[PDB]
């Protein structure tokens, strides 16, 4: 019985030196992400809506144009909702599908349903159009490096549908796509032909991005079994800062602070966490002041903060993957 699912417990990053850190800082472009990945997503896109379809096509199109060998799968299913049966579609983008282990980055691409109000439309800019655009920018920025993957370890991106409650949050009305996908992955043998390991055993770490884009976020270290990876993010932020590679940033106002959080935040990682998958939940505490209001829009986003976080996340991913 191979002990491969235990490898994630000992996996160590391959730390980039200064020269490589500057290369990564210069290789990502917040303005290109803004125009080409973010703005097309700033539309109403609740499950089943025409915007949901447009959002999904945009995400797939942006991934399909890259050189790395991404394999796209749309996981479509039915679920009961306060409005009756409905269809949802998770988007999964994977490099090396048969690779035994994957580092997984995720976010939700649906937007919370709200009837139009005084002509305002909810577009959930930080929740989670920006996280989505950040995953797309990361795939674009590291494309040349990711091409080299074409440690049996690779990368996967999941864009969940139906994270939001149709009404207010309840156990049965929220996390439609993640509850579905976690159960599906838990019952899918992996790698192909395996006797007793599933796709969940292959998830080295689930990095879930949510509510990102507002000024001064503070991300707490939620779980002891991913704490050493939260520390890597702190170290990366500190060195990019010291190298003068971040913008309008100070260590007193650093994003990754040394502090736990006992409570439970309901989000897409829950169904995975509860089946034993290690999770790094990149959600700030407190939430953006515009959370679930019509003001969660483009105008209230903090560009240099998103830019800094794109740099930190891209360095984290390269180091994790030894690229
Ligand atoms: Zn939300």
Domains contained in the chain, CATH given: 1-323 (3.40.630.10)
- 13: how many CB neighbours lie within 10 A of its CB? 18
Q: Is 66 exposed, middle or buried (0-12, 13-18, 19+ CB in 10 A)?
A: middle
The DSSP code sequence of 159-207 is EES--S-SSS--SSSS-HHHHHHHHHHHTSBSSTT-SS-BTTTTEEEEE
What are the structure tokens assigned to 10, written together? 């000992």
Give the 3-state secondary structure of 82-112: CCCCEEEEEEEEECCCCCCEEEEEEEECCCC
Q: How many residues would you count in the chain?
A: 323
Resolution of the experimental structure, in angstroms: 2.0
How far away, in angstroms, is 39 Cα from ligand 1 center?
18
Which spans in the chain are helix H?
Answer: 18-27, 30-33, 50-64, 130-141, 143-147, 176-186, 227-242, 270-273, 303-321
Chain centroid to CA 49: 22
Closest CA to 164 of 264, 261, 273, 48: 48
Q: Is 224 exposed, middle or buried (0-12, 13-18, 19+ CB in 10 A)?
A: exposed
Q: Is 2 exposed, middle or buried (0-12, 13-18, 19+ CB in 10 A)?
A: exposed
Technique behind the model: X-ray
| Residues around ligand 1, an ion, CB closer than 5 A | 127
Helix, strand, or coil (residue 53): helix
How far away, in angstroms, is 289 Cα from ligand 1 center?
12
What are the structure tokens assigned to 146, written together? 């990711």
How far away, in angstroms, is 211 Cα from ligand 1 center?
8
How far away, in angstroms, is 125 Cα from ligand 1 center?
10
């Amino acid at each position: 019985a191979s002990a491969w699912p235990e490898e994630k417990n000992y996996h160590q990053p391959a730390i980039l030196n200064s020269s490589a850190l500057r290369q990564i800082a210069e290789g990502t472009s917040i303005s290109e992400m803004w125009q080409n990945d973010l703005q097309p997503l700033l539309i109403e896109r609740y499950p089943g809506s025409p915007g949901s379809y447009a959002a999904r096509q945009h995400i797939m199109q942006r991934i399909q144009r890259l050189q790395a060998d991404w394999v796209l799968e749309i996981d479509t299913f039915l679920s009961q909702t306060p409005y009756g049966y409905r269809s949802f579609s998770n988007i999964i983008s994977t490099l090396n599908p048969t690779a035994k282990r994957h580092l997984v980055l995720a976010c939700h691409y649906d937007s919370k349903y709200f009837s139009h109000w005084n002509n305002r439309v909810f577009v959930g800019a930080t929740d989670s159009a920006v996280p989505c655009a950040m995953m797309l920018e990361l795939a674009r920025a590291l494309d040349k490096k990711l091409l080299s993957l074409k440690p049996d370890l690779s990368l996967q991106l999941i864009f969940f549908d139906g994270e939001e409650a149709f009404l207010h949050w309840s156990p049965q009305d929220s996390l439609y796509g993640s509850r579905h996908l976690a159960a599906k992955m838990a019952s899918t043998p992996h790698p192909p032909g395996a006797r007793g390991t599933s796709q969940l055993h292959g998830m080295d770490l689930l990095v879930l991005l949510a509510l990102i884009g507002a000024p001064n976020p503070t991300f707490p270290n939620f779980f002891p079994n991913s704490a050493r990876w939260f520390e890597r993010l702190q170290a990366i932020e500190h060195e990019l800062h010291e190298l003068g590679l971040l913008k309008d940033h100070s260590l007193e106002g650093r994003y990754f602070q040394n502090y736990s959080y006992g409570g439970v935040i309901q989000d897409d990682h829950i169904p995975f966490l509860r089946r034993g998958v290690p999770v790094l939940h990149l959600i700030p505490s407190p939430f953006p002041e515009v959370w679930h209001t019509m003001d969660d829009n483009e105008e209230n986003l903090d560009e240099s903060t998103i830019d800094n976080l794109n740099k930190i996340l891209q360095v984290f991913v390269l180091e994790y993957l030894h690229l």
